[model samples]
Target chain A: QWVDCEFTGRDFRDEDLSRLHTERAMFSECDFSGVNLAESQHRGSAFRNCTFERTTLWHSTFAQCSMLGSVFVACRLRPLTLDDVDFTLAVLGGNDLRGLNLTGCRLRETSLVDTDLRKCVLRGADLSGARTTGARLDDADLRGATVDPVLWRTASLVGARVDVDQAVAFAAAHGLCL
Target chain B: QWVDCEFTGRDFRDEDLSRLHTERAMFSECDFSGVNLAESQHRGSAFRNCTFERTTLWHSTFAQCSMLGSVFVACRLRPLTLDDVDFTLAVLGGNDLRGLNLTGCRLRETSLVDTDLRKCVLRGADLSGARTTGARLDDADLRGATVDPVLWRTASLVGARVDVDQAVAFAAAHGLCL
Candidate 1:
């Protein structure tokens, strides 16, 4: 059934949303625990205050979607092209975003503790006030990222590349003459 | 005549003081410009605000001496043993201190700009507010040295050894997890 309807406060646990063609659907306060949304083409969808516990979003393309205040606990988020998605105040801890291009994503105040972001291209991303302790940033291009001194130390920047001016400033701040 | 008297505000320029034996002498506010104090044995001597411009102090042994606020511009300080000496606020800029042991020296606000400190042992030295720009700390042991973070980066830390806790703290501050 192609349900292009709004599901408010609905229980979608263990639902098979695989390859579901849902365009401009609204899911507010819904429980999507253990739901398989793999390879689902969701364009311009809105999901607010939704709990996606253990939800499989593998190989999903979420374009121009707004998932504000969404709790994606233990969700499979890899192999996905998340373009223009608003995940502000989202709980994405322990997510493996290795080599993911999250350009222009709003991750302000996002919980990224112990997340694997190695070799990821985070250019022009605003990561201010983001908790990234123990986050792997090996070979990550952090050019133009808004990172403070405290968070810069907490996150792993070893082998991580930065802009030339940024590197000079960081070294100068640390007392390297030049 | 073995002049073992206090030389205050005296000008001893171009004097040959080689192999001069002096003990417990005071050379306060004296000008030792172009004076050769090489191989001189001085013990318990005090040399406050003394100018040693172009002075040759090679092979000089100064033990338990206080050379506070002294200026050593264009002076030769090699082959010298400065044990228990206090050089607080002294100007020792552009000097090569390779393989020298400056343990527990008080270098507060000292000017060491463009100094070659390669392989020098500066352990337990208080280098607070020291101007160490263009200073070579390669293979220099900075263990227990009180250095500012700015000086830590300005100088070359490559192959330079530091304390374990210091290394960890530096790396963590630079965003290396553990």
Candidate 2:
């Protein structure tokens, strides 16, 4: 019953937050460090600039939530359900997010450096300004992804899967016309 | 016995230069416009800026010659044995030059518009600055060929065969890191 609740700058370090359901809540600057957020469901919530170090978010759902500038260091994020989530300016470096479906996620300026995103379904994701250097995207699908121009030049998309229109865009970024 | 002879600006137009054996000869600015040079054998000759409109060079063998700025409009160029011929700045438009083995030819800045170069062996050929729009190079081999970077962008290499090094060059020209 945390709907429409406001918990700003609160400390929840090493707390058991498993299976918690919160909708339309505001939790800005909350420190969720070393917490168990497994199977938690959040909708229309705002967790801006929150810390998630050593947090286990297994099977958590973050639909239509804004987690801007959040740091997710050494977190367990597998099979996480993300729908229309805004991860702008978030630091998710060195995470093994393989096979994660990032569809409809807004990852503007998110740091995904040294992340293993192999075979990830990034189709239709907004990856504008995301740091993808040293990111492994082998067999990952980038079709219809709203990616920045720098992504093609810097990212190692050697084995990344793409469609015809995507091919034209990739080639165009490399100084080719059609 | 036309060896070591210099025939500069001579009017060989519409004349039967067929089956003539000439070595170390020079025919600069000579008009070969609308004549038969069929079955002719030459070694170390120069025929610069010549007009070969409607001229038939069928079964001709030109070895180690320079035909710079030559116009070959409506000429029969097939079955012509060529060796070390430099066609720099030549207009070889709309010619069906399929299956020609250009082992040591140089066509720098040559116009090959609408030319059928399918199945041609262009190994180690100098094809820099050539206009290749509407050129059919399907099934052609470009291994070891020093081609312009624009060739990969403008030309349709649908079925063109390339070696490993050439493939890397092509990929690099298309904005991919090798």
Candidate 3:
């Protein structure tokens, strides 16, 4: 049931598209490798430069999607519900993206190396120059995130939930003489 | 040539001068918390509001320096030779800067979170609003740099060496059919 359809360069690899009930669809440059797209229900879609390698997008549900430069390697993003998704420059390396809600998702410069973002819900996500070497942001909830300061002092913000100017710029880059 | 030398608020802790030859130096508001200025040979220095906590500037050799708003935690930046340094709004978190030679550095809004800039040599650097989450840019060599493509697709470019108008604006933001 693909409403407003327009699938360009389509292949639909390993297709299942789990009972697709897509709306305002437009999957351009599509491949969707190893696709399953579980429990799907997309709205306002527009996946440009798509190539969802090993894709499954579990419990899928995207709203106002525009997956630009898409390349979700080994993808299975849990109980997904990405609202206003853009994922600019998207690569999303080594994915596990647990507990995803990704509000205000633009995710500029999206690679997320060693990705396993534990408890992720990144409120107000902009992630200016994201690289997060060996990333596993345990209990991640980066409030109003525009994080820098060397990726907030090399990830693993134990029990993470930043505010107050990223906790005084993480105690002035972990010199902690505050 | 240690002009107007007034080591203000001096504490020079854990001192291990690797034969200091500081020129035109005026270490303002100094505390140099864990100084080990390795293989030192500074020139035209002016470390303002300094408090280099855990400082061990590995293989240091600066020229035309001005460490503005300084607070370098866990510093051991290898073979460092930061020419034309200003480091405006510096924090430089979780450093593991491979092949460091930050040419013309200013880093306007620097935070550089999760920093491990692989093969680093950011030429003509500005990094407008730097945050760089999970930063581990594999083989980084951003030529004539002023990066933006959503922070260059969230870092980690295997054999990274950008130029030529950032490869045609990263193939027109991943809509490559060029």
Candidate 4:
């Protein structure tokens, strides 16, 4: 019965959010740390400034959701489906999001250090200022994605796909003379 | 009739030296440029500071010979034998010496740019200060060979044989922060 509802500054720590279905709801400053969000479906929901420490989002589906300023520390977000989700200003460090389709996702200024994004579909994703050092991006599709030069030099991208412009920039970023 | 003879400062340019047999001869400062040395055999011969520009050395045999300071520009060096030869300070650029056994060969300061040394044996070879940019050394044995950091960074050595120390040096040369 939380559909179309608005909740702010709620302390929902160590709770089981599995099978929690919500639509058109707004949860601002919600502490969702240590929550079991298995098979959760969120439609048109906005979670702003939420913290998800060691949260498990397995089999969750987020359709048209916005997670602005959310901080996810060591969360399991690989098996989740994010359809047209905007995660701007989110801090998602050390998360393994391998083989996920994050196309056109708004991930600007996101802290993605040591994140395993191997074989992920990142075409057209806005990853500007994403702190993605020590990340494994092998075989990832990064065409038209907005990335920084540090990502090209620091992160591993063997067999990753990129456009000609990105390829030139990446080769130059690897200290190649030419 | 040049066996055990000394031919100093001789100009043998554009001559047909094919199948020429010589033993223990010294050709000092000789210009053997543009010579057809097909199937020629030189044993215990020393060719110091010689010029061999655009010549073909197909099937030539050089046993216990010394070619110090010789410049070989655009010469065909494949299908040749270099048994116990010292090629120090020699410029053999753009020569295809594929699958040649050059073990213990002295090649210090040699110009091997664009040279095909694939599958060649270069163990114990001195390649210090060698200009080997654009050299193809795939599957070549480079163990115990004296090489510089520039060669590790510039030369392509896919599947080439090297020691553990050289392997680490090569990994670092590839900008790997491991």
Which candidate number would show the highest TM-score if scored against the true structure? 4
The 0-to-1 C-alpha lDDT of every candidate, in the order given, reads 0.78, 0.82, 0.75, 0.84
**Model 4 Cα displacement at B59 (Å)?**
36
Q: So what's the TM-score on candidate 1?
A: 0.55
Which residue pairs clash within candidate 2? none
Q: TM-score for model 3?
A: 0.24
Chain A TM-scores in order: 0.86, 0.91, 0.34, 0.94
Write one digit per residue (lDDT tens) for candidate 2, span B1-178.
Answer: 5898898788888998789888989887788888988999988998888888889898999999988998889889888899999999999988889899997589899999988898888888989999998888777878777888678766667567655555545555554332
- Model 4 vs truth, CA RMSD: 12.6
lDDT of 4 by residue, B90-157 (tens): 98888888999999899888888898998999998889988888999888988888888789877777
TM-score, one value per model: 0.55, 0.55, 0.24, 0.57
Indicate the fraction of true inter-chain contacts that candidate 4 also forms: 0.00
Q: Give Cα distance to truth, residue A6, candidate 1, Å.
A: 33
Model 2 chain A poorest 10 in a row by lDDT: A169-178
Using lDDT as the measure, name the better of candidate 3 and candidate 4: 4
For every prediction, compared with the true complex, DockQ reads 0.08, 0.07, 0.02, 0.05
lDDT tens per residue, model 3, A1-178:
7888788989999988785888888888899999888888888888888899988988878898888788889888787877888887888878998778787787777878888887787878887777778787777787887877667567776666656566555533433222
| Residue A134, candidate 3: C-alpha displacement in angstroms | 1.9
Q: How accurate is candidate 1 locally (lDDT)?
A: 0.78
Candidates 1 and 3 compared by TM-score, better number: 1
Q: Candidate 2, B33: how far from true, in Å? A: 1.2
Off by over 4 Å in 3: A2-13, A22-33, A36-53, A56-61, A64-73, A76-113, A116-123, A126-133, A136-143, A146-151, A155-164, A171-173, B1-178
CAPRI-style quality class for the chain A–B interface of candidate 1: incorrect
* C-alpha DockQ for predicted model 4: 0.05
